[PDB]
């Protein structure tokens, strides 16, 4: 029951994410990131910043792939990544991804997304695997298809 997967440098920072948690009626955010999965300090800050009723879990890519293949996911879940490489590695780990939302990436391509060489490489692999990829900060924001810049 992964409802929504998003690439966002802010993660759970601000009013940006909560629009998405309302829209998809999210009960659970999984932040899938190696560094954050390592770092209790940034986990504590993100837990401190999360809205009232939200369960937040942190996984490395490896561990998340393992869980994905070993555990059914009941709660309505939003996955947040910070880069397309971890998304593609999750796809090879059997994440079925028809639609991928890109929030903020901090070179410049559009207002909110700054792409490197690695980013363009993996984004191209994602769009190649069939995934529909949309830059959109907020549900009311204008959609731009990322393939545009690939």
Residue 15: which residues within 8 A CB-CB, separation 6 or more? Answer: none
Tell me how far apart the alpha carbons of residues 6 and 2 are, in angstroms, rounded to a whole number: 11
Give the CATH fold of the 1-150 domain: Fructose Permease (3.40.35)
Distance CA 70, CA 13 (A): 30
Q: Where are the beta strands (DSSP E) in 19-128?
A: 28-32, 55-59, 77-81, 99-102, 108-110, 113-114
- In what helix (H) or strand (E) does residue 2 lie, and over which residues does it extend? strand 2-7
Cβ–Cβ under 8 Å, residues 38 and 85: no
Angle at the Cα of 113 from the Cα atoms of 107 and 114, rounded to 5 degrees: 15
């Amino acid at each position: 029951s992964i409802e929504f997967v998003r690439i966002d440098d802010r993660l759970v920072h601000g009013q940006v994410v909560t629009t998405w948690l309302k829209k998809y009626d999210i009960e659970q955010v999984i932040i899938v990131n190696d560094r954050i999965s390592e770092d209790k300090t940034r986990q504590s800050i993100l837990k401190i910043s999360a809205p009232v009723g939200l369960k937040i879990v942190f996984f490395s890519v490896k561990r998340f792939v393992e869980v994905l293949n070993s555990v059914p996911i009941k709660k309505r879940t939003m996955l947040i990544y910070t880069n397309p490489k971890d998304v593609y590695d999750s796809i090879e780990g059997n994440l079925k991804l028809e639609y991928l939302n890109v929030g903020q990436m901090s070179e410049k391509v559009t207002g909110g997304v700054a792409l490197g060489e690695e980013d363009k490489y993996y984004f191209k692999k994602i769009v190649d695997k069939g995934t529909r990829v949309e830059i959109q900060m907020v549900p009311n924001d204008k959609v731009t298809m990322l393939e545009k810049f690939l």
